[PDB]
Design a protein around this ligand. Structure first.
Ligand SMILES: CCNC(=O)N1CCN(C(C)=O)CC1
Ligand SMILES: [Cl-]
Ligand SMILES: [Cl-]
Ligand SMILES: [Cl-]
Ligand SMILES: [Cl-]
Ligand SMILES: [Cl-]
Ligand SMILES: [Mg+2]
Length: 348
């Protein structure tokens, strides 16, 4: 056991191992109660997150367990990993607090799309890295569910990591009106058309790739219905085959009230873009999720010829998510979480 010291951060007593020095908050609330520190064991600048009320309800205790299981599993160059996890508790009986430690990068995609000039070469390398990380994530049967520029970290050398996995978090108010929290979501999840699957993340990659090419949001809807009208004007209204797959009768009925529209010519929307970039956008932004290109198929597209290496695009170890259908009490979820804290092995 390391020695711990106490200090007042975010109006609360933080108790951390001596290895973590010069703590000071970061993200101004956007990431939670997360501080920047210097890790004297590794020499890295790190983010230390103190969970708030991790065991306050069955729902919160299971969310705590889900987040720690996911972060312990993810071991890939283009995905956030877990550097450390700790508790000052010396037994299960006094266990109350959980602290997560990750690497910290300098910026997010929002801070390079807004204020920088991107070559086609920059767009190739950024989208290549998102798809390499998604091949890995999807191989474990994990759905991200919330890819958008603020969830993509990027350094001075244009190297990218995926963070902030959807932990089933987002509220109705958070998705309402003129908000970036909804602009990257696939239509089948935005309007609850059907049971969704990993194809929702490829719709999001299309929206991000389009914004890197034009500097403008692809579908900046003012509400759910305005956004659907923007989507259907580009990709066309649904045909009888997709309408059959919308399990919600009322959602099917609303779609059929709209005048039919053909798919637009993407060369006339993305004026001057690399023809290979136009071709790949046409394969991602497909209304029927069954017919979208997958991450593994997209890596072999000619747009990425410069970067693609089929011997260096790794898949994940198997991930057991059977806990997601399990019904347990608060103290059972808390005991499962304690065992995952004490069994953690740091990376090389
Ligand atoms: C835009 C740069 N920010 C980051 O690199 N991340 C790393 C992961 N982290 C937490 C809570 O562990 C928050 C922020
Ligand atoms: Cl220490
Ligand atoms: Cl990492
Ligand atoms: Cl504790
Ligand atoms: Cl964003
Ligand atoms: Cl597992
Ligand atoms: Mg985020």
């Amino acid at each position: 056991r390391p020695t711990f010291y106490r200090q007042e951060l975010n109006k609360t007593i933080w108790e951390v191992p001596e290895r973590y020095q010069n703590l000071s908050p970061v993200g101004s609330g956007a990431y939670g109660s997360v501080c920047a520190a210097f890790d004297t064991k590794t020499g890295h600048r790190v983010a230390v997150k103190k969970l708030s009320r991790p065991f306050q309800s069955i729902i919160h205790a299971k969310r705590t367990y889900r987040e720690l299981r996911l972060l312990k599993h993810m071991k890939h160059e283009n995905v956030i990993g877990l550097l450390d996890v700790f508790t000052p508790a010396r037994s299960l009986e006094e266990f109350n607090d959980v602290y997560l430690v990750t690497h910290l990068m300098g910026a997010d995609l929002n801070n390079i799309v807004k204020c920088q000039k991107l070559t086609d070469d920059h767009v190739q390398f950024l989208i290549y890295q998102i798809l390499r990380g998604l091949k890995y994530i999807h191989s474990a049967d994990i759905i991200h569910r919330d890819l958008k520029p603020s969830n993509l970290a990027v350094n001075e050398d244009c190297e990218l990591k995926i963070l902030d996995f959807g932990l089933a978090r987002h509220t109705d108010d958070e998705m309402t009106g003129y908000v970036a929290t909804r602009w990257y979501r696939a239509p089948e999840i935005m309007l609850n058309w059907m049971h969704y699957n990993q194809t929702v993340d490829i719709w999001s990659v299309g929206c991000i790739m389009a914004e890197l090419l034009t500097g403008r949001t692809l579908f900046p809807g003012t509400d759910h219905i305005d956004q659907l009208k923007l989507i259907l004007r580009l990709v066309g209204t649904p045909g009888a085959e997709l309408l059959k797959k919308i399990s919600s009768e009322s959602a099917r009925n609303y779609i059929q009230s709209l005048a039919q529209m053909p798919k637009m010519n993407f060369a006339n929307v993305f004026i001057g873009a690399n023809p290979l970039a136009v071709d790949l956008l046409e394969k991602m932004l497909v209304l029927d999720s069954d017919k979208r290109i997958t991450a593994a198929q997209a890596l072999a597209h000619a747009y990425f010829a410069q970067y693609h290496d089929p011997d260096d695009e790794p898949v994940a170890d198997p991930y057991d998510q059977s806990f997601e259908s399990r019904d347990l009490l608060i103290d059972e979820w808390k005991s499962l979480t304690y065992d995952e804290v004490i069994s953690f092995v740091p990376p090389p």
